[PDB]
């Protein structure tokens, strides 16, 4: 319904949850780190696993989700 970069934190969460129900658990994590649309597109696997404490699985799933909407920015990968 909007450019990924214009997403609020809640709208980022909504994206991740509706595409992978297994990631709903990480809602509050995204809120703490204040990951809105701009922040989401700026993420990398490193920052996810080092500083957000996400495991390999989830991190990979999130990398994938960002890759679907981050346009021609470099694909996130482990």
């Amino acid at each position: 319904d909007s450019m990924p970069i214009d997403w609020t934190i809640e709208e980022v969460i909504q994206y991740i949850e509706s595409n992978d129900n297994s990631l709903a658990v990480h809602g509050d994590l995204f809120r703490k780190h204040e990951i809105d649309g701009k922040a989401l597109l700026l993420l990398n696997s490193e920052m996810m696993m080092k500083y957000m404490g996400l495991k390999e699985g989830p991190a990979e799933k999130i990398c994938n989700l960002v890759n679907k909407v981050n346009g021609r920015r470099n694909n996130l990968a482990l």
Partner: protein
């Protein structure tokens, strides 16, 4: 020229780029131009309460700063 900037210079930079919220932490830690441009993400993380979103945003802003220069 960012390398000339003092602590006040950094605050204003943060201000006009919609990062007003972080000026006081930056001041308290005496982040002037020189230190600014030296900052890594590992450094930026505790300066913003270990929050990734803001950390990345600030890292990006500095990187952009370094571009036209």
């Amino acid at each position: 020229m960012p390398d000339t900037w003092n602590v006040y210079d950094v605050s204003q930079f943060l201000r006009v780029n919609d990062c007003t919220a972080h000026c006081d932490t930056f001041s308290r830690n005496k982040i002037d131009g020189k230190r600014l441009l030296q900052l890594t993400k590992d450094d930026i993380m505790p300066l913003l309460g270990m929050k990734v979103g803001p950390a990345l945003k600030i890292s990006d802003l500095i990187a952009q700063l370094k571009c036209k220069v």
